[PDB]
Amino acid sequence: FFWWLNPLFKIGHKRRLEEDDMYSVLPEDRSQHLGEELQGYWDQEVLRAEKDAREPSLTKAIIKCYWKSYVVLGIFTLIEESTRVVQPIILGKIIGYFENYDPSDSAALYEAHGYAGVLSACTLVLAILHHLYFYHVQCAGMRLRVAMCHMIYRKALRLSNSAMGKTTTGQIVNLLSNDVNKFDQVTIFLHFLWAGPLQAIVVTALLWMEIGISCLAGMAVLIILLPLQSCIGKLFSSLRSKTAAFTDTRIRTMNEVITGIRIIKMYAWEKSFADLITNLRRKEISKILRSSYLRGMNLASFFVASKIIVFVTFTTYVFLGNVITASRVFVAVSLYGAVRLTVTLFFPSAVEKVSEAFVSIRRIKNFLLLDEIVNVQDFTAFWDKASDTPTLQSLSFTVRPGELLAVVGPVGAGKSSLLSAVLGELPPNQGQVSVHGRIAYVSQQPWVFSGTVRSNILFGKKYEKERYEKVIKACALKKDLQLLEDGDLTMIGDRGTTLSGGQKARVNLARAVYQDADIYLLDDPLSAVDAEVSRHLFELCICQALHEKIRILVTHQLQYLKAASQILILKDGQMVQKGEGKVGFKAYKNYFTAGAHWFIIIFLILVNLAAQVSYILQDWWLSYWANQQSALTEKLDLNWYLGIYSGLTASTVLFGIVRSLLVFFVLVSSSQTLHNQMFESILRAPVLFFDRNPIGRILNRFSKDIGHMDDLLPLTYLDFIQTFLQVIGVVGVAVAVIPWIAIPLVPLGIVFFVLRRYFLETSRDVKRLESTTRSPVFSHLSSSLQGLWTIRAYKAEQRFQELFDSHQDLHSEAWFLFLTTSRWFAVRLDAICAVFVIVVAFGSLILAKTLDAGQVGLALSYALTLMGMFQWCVRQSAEVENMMISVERVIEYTDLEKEAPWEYQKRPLPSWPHEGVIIFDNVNFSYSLDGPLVLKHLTALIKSKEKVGIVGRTGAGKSSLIAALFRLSEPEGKIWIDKILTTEIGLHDLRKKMSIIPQEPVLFTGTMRKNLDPFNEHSDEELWNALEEVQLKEAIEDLPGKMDTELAESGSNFSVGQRQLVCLARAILRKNRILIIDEATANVDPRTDELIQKKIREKFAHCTVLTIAHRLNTIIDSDKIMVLDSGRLKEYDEPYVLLQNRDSLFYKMVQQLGKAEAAALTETAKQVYFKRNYP
Ligand SMILES: CCCCC[C@H](O)/C=C/[C@H]1[C@H](O)CC(=O)[C@@H]1CCCCCCC(=O)O
């Protein structure tokens, strides 16, 4: 009865409930312990399977782990199902007292009361057994999931570096998110796989006693259904699993869309991704309609099946020459209610939920069986033996205390591979490695995890102010922490997205120093800070402070190599040299009306009511036939009675099926419509909307909220509506047969709404608390997998495992409160139902002078159903009301403000732009109407085929100028392009016909064709011409196809210079006169960059060129340069003359480049000026 929650409900009505308030689970369910129990039997199973020389079975481990405990609960199943078959036989005796009634017999009146007490006792026994069983199997299910997730995490810590090549982080995280949650549904139903068939046999015997040989026909239909519903259950699981391939591909496209949306806009590619998503969605909904219609036929099987089974049974019974009496019919009808529940719901539900679990156990088995001084001599190793060449060859080196080793060479030279060899992550194929002392591993990609920055630094070490502050200053971190409002206690995101790159890098590095290790493997740590901070970190921390320790420093900063004791140059893998909360009716009306014309939704309501009325009327018709037969040689004309009866069952079967299918049609159509609306709105929504949201907050709408609307929500409505209309049926038949019942009902109804409200006040707190507690788990796994390298290097695995157990058992507390609260509530709705069953039974005996046998048989046969039905109905209603938060979260995106039309009715000439001139008149710009002006007063002219660029301080509007030409947010003032006003041509006129090389490139998933030509407008040989112009041909021809080859995911198989060259290829392909070049990005190689600059100058010599210069040399060829400051055009003049104007800002900046570079620029400026002056 869960009384221990009662004070928490009181607390949750006086207050909102909070995370500290929930009761902790037993020490026996602690995730640390609970995982080791299954890990042990998996070890044993691997041993056995080994000795047998066979594949191990994870199903074997799980049974050999849990079977002892879970087979005990079958005792409740046995006594529950024993009561369900007893209770109808007593009901037969009550109705008997009516069939043979006389008011005079005191002893009979007393006898009937005795059975009314036994029938009431059975009901209360059954109510508590139902709750003791269903509460325990849900806790057995929860234990299995926790043990699973502990094992999945345990393995993932130790995975092989090669294994990371054959399953991605997101797929591992999909195990926890989507695969393990199938286990909670396994344990709930298994015990029905034997109780169902057994109960079928027991009921077969009893019905043989009640109505003789006809018993077989009813069971004959049941053995037609039991295969069929199992076959449907298998095919449903086949269909559903195939949709996962479409849905995951769709979501990965949405991720590259929403992450990339600025560039997709700038290239006007929106048509491409619109079509591509539309086709994946059109395929996916092709399966989801089909998979849904199957599942709707499964629920329409439960609803209708009991009426078919009864109909065939009584059909044979009257042809065999029998006559109906009310005791026989309502005993028979009542028994089939038992077999209907277990065999038709719980045996199919067991089969399909076990079948679905094997899909998860199969994947998890495939995951669990994945692979799992400093002196180096003659070292050679392959990351993948399949490679034709070694990643390190004939390496020999050694480093001793006080030595600093600089590791130098090109990108992919093997420097990081050298560090991996030191780390032991790359084992030798020949040669040897020996290390003594504690390693300090500074990964090239900084690793930062959720917590405090101080938690990131301490990393389990004791806090000590002096050394800690010495690190904070030595890692040049004091200033930032003083700028932060919460200091070192500031909260950090899953990946430090709230932190700058140099911040996360410096925090990582500070962490390394805090450990006070012996061997420091510094992998390019200084590249993420400015030159002043870079040399401050090198000189004080690396040269002065870490001096007493072995250091190997993978660096490109040649400026520091003079301080190294020894330098190792690697090339081509070998050593070169060594020296909310509530929704309103509007959201329901929209969700249904979006799906169809009102003619459909009103027809749907008339089909529902027709189905339910026919369902009630069949049973009333039996009762009426019983009364008639009991009123009477002479006999009823079956061709009348059996006639009309056939119609009522026929209508029930028909509208039951139509009802179930049509709900899925209307609601899936609704979700199809809302997805396209939402997607059109997300395409045409301006960039500003994507700055005011993080990517995950948008992508959740498409991944989760559309997910609920397609799969789970339409089922939940159908499940609710089938139940709810039967509840209204029970109450309506009881009140119609014996009106006086209306009086007790009133207080009982008031108690129901008081009870309901008092629970629901807390329910929306537990649901929230559960949902908020769940996410940190997946966050931790993601952080851990990213840090896999480093966490492993520090030997920190045991702490991280304990942290995952901490998060996991937290959610176990939340889930445990959710379980117990739902049962506290469900128990008492059964208690209200028991009061209803009591009042019906006793009231009928009070009023016995007025009722008659068929009437009482009907009233009771309905009231007995209520116990399971009513407690479920109200708890489904709380799920519908939760999921409508999804439908409200998508509906708000359907109406986001829109960018101005892609095309006006005014359109430019197909030859426009002809001349490639641009003019600015008094323009001002800001990213949003509410914001400050970022650029102001500006006016300028660009002539045909001029070469110019933009310089200034950061935030001067450099990025704003490119944003203005594209009208990403509308301008103040005027810009003309080719004598026509930019605001008067459509965005697809304007954003095409100019070209923009972005600072950071993007490779979309797909073919090299699509990544170069999504329109297939360029001729088949032109890409080879363009590819030859970037000279990428001799690399890409090595792919499995010369063209139309698949790229790797995100183009990860190409290096940054190659990626940028693909963007240069895109520029080469489209022919338009106007080019803006974005700023050069970080760590590009020092050779292809000059090639790019040379090729740009060579090929686009006939274009009008702007540029945003990261470093000035990239544009000192230009005719004129614009100088911005404080959001205003300071200077627009020739670079030479600017350098002549020593007062110019341009000179005031170039003076900062140092005497040598200043002199070089002086002479080269004079030279190019002379060259320009000659003609
Ligand atoms: C369990 C899968 C959904 C079944 C939906 C179906 O419409 C029937 C539901 C009722 C039925 O009318 C009588 C009955 O006992 C079902 C409700 C109990 C289903 C199992 C959940 C038990 C619980 O949580 O208390």
Is residue 328 within 8 Å of residue 189, measured between CB atoms? no
Residue type, 107: A
Method of determination used here: cryo-EM
> How is residue 273 written in tokens?
């991704």
CA of 725 to the centre of ligand 1 (A): 14
989-993 contacts: CB < 8 A, separation 24 or more?
Answer: 989/903, 989/907, 989/908, 990/966, 991/265, 991/266, 991/267, 991/268, 991/966, 991/967, 992/268, 992/1072, 993/912, 993/913, 993/1072, 993/1074
Residue 1175 burial class via C-beta count within 10 angstroms: exposed 0-12, middle 13-18, buried 19 and up: exposed
- The amino acid that residue 399 corresponds to is V
With 0-12 / 13-18 / 19 or more C-beta atoms within 10 angstroms meaning exposed / middle / buried, residue 530 is exposed
CA 254 to chain centre: 12
Residue 405 token pair: 């080793």
In a domain, 301, yes or no: no
CA of 210 to the centre of ligand 1 (A): 28
Q: Say how far apart CA 696 and CA 693 lie, in whole Å.
A: 8
Token pair belonging to 957: 């509007």
Domain-located, residue 39: yes
Decide: 860 and 94 in contact? Cβ < 8 Å: yes
Taking the centre of ligand 1 as the mean of its atom positions, its distance from the CA of residue 718, in whole angstroms, is 12
In sequence order, the 6+-apart residues with CB closer than 8 A to the CB of 612 are 725, 726, 728, 729
Alpha-carbon distance of 983 to 16, in angstroms, equals: 53
Alpha-helical runs (H) found in 158-191: 169-174
Write out the DSSP string of 396-442: EEEE-TT-EEEEE-STTSSHHHHHHHHHTSS--SEEEEEE-S-EEEE
CA of 868 to the centre of ligand 1 (A): 7
In a domain, 110, yes or no: yes
Whether residue 153 contacts residue 781, with contact meaning beta carbons closer than 8 Å, is answered with: yes
Task: Tell me which residue of 617, 82, 86 sits closest to 307, measured CA to CA.
Answer: 617
Can you state the angle between helices 347-368 and 215-266, rounded to 10 degrees?
Answer: 40
**Three-class SS state of 1074:** strand
> Which residue's CA is minimally distant from atom 24 of ligand 1?
872
Helix, strand, or coil here: 339? helix
CB 915 within 8 A of CB 944: yes
Alpha-carbon distances of 472 from 49, 548, 725, rounded to whole Å: 53, 20, 67
Flag whether 597 is in a domain: no
Residue 320, judged by CB atoms within 10 A of its CB (0-12, 13-18, 19+), counts as exposed
User: In total, how many domains does the chain have?
Assistant: 3
Euclidean distance between CA atoms 176 and 785, whole angstroms: 13
Which atom of ligand 1 approaches the CA of 826 most closely? 25
Count, residues in the chain: 1175
Return the ligand 1 atom nearest residue 822 CA: 24
3-state secondary structure of 1003: coil
> Do the beta carbons of residue 56 and residue 45 sit within 8 Å?
yes
Q: What is the CATH number of the domain that holds 445?
A: 3.40.50.300
* 364 found inside a domain: no
Q: Which tokens hold the place of 967?
A: 């009208």
Pairing between strand 972-977 and 918-925?
A: antiparallel
The alpha carbon dihedral of 580, 585, 588, 593 has a sign of negative
Ligand 1 center to residue 304 CA distance, Å?
A: 15
* Angstrom distance (rounded) from CA 415 to CA 409: 7
List the resolution, Å.
3.5
Ligand 1 centroid to residue 719 C-alpha, Å: 9
From atom 12 of ligand 1, which residue's Cα is the shortest distance away? 869
Q: Confirm whether 139 is domain-assigned.
A: yes
> What residues form DSSP beta bridges with 442?
522
Ligand 1 geometric centre to CA of 178 (Å): 24
Q: What is the three-state SS of 227-242?
A: HHHHHHHHHHHHHHHH
Query: Which atom belonging to ligand 1 lies closest to the Cα atom of 868?
Result: 15
Is 664 within the bounds of a domain? no
Q: Domain of 471?
A: 391-572
The one-character DSSP state at 1007 is B
- Distance of CA 723 from the midpoint of ligand 1 (Å): 8
Rg, C-alpha atoms of the chain: 38
CA angle 442–444–446, rounded 5-degree value: 75
Strands 574-578 and 935-942, by their bridges, are unpaired
The sign one gets for the Cα dihedral 844, 845, 851, 855 is: positive
For residue 54, the SS3 value is coil
Encoding tokens for residue 741?
């019942």
Domain termination residue (choose one: 800, 824, 846): 846
CA 8, chain centre distance (Å): 32
Q: Whose CA is nearest to atom 5 of ligand 1?
A: 719
How many other C-beta atoms can be found within 10 angstroms of the C-beta atom of residue 576? 12
Q: How far is the CA of 839 from the centre of ligand 1 (A)?
A: 24
Atom of ligand 1 nearest to the CA of 303: 7
Phi, psi torsion values for 901, nearest 5 degrees: -55, 145
- How many other C-beta atoms lie within 10 A of the C-beta of residue 440? 25
Which residue of 352, 872, 874 sits with most ligand 1 atoms within 8 Å of its CB, as the best mutation to test the pocket? 872
Q: Is residue 1056 part of a domain?
A: no
Q: How far is CA 641 from CA 99, 386, 636, 869, 976, in A?
A: 21, 81, 8, 31, 87
What is the distance between the alpha carbons of residues 926 and 936, in angstroms, rounded to a whole number? 9
**Rounded to whole angstroms, how far apart are CA atoms 744 and 723?**
23
Q: Ligand 1: which of 345, 608, 728 to mutate, most ligand atoms within 8 Å of CB?
A: 345
Residue 320 has φ and ψ, to the nearest 5°, of: -75, 0
Question: Residue 295: what residue type?
Answer: R
Which residue's CA is the nearest one to ligand 1's atom 6?
719
> Tell me, what amino acid is at 456?
N
Helix (H, G, I), strand (E, B) or coil at 1077: strand
The two tokens of residue 22 are: 């929930």
Domain boundary among 572, 603, 619: 572
The residues lining ligand 1, judged by C-beta closer than 6 Å to any ligand atom, are 134, 302, 341, 345, 349, 719, 722-723, 826, 868-869, 871-872
Q: Reduce the DSSP state of residue 1131 to 3 states and report it.
A: strand
Q: Which two tokens stand for residue 419?
A: 């560090």
Cis before 913? omega within 30: yes
Contact 174, 367 (CB under 8 A): no
Say if residues 811 and 101 touch (Cβ distance below 8 Å): no
Nearest residue CA, atom 10 of ligand 1? 869
The per-type count for the chain, helices as H runs and strands as E runs, is 40, 21
3-state secondary structure 568-622: EEEECCEEEEECCCCCCHHHHHHHHHCCCCHHHHHHHHHHHHHHHHHHHHHHHHH
Which residue, of 846, 873, 894, is where some domain finishes? Answer: 846
Query: Which atom, in ligand 1's list, is nearest to the CA of 871?
Result: 25
Residue closest to 515 by CA, chosen among 475, 467, 452 = 467
3 state DSSP class of 912: coil
Relative to the CA of 865, which ligand 1 atom is closest? 13
Q: Which residues contact 964 (CB under 8 A, 6 or more apart)?
A: 923, 925, 935, 971, 975
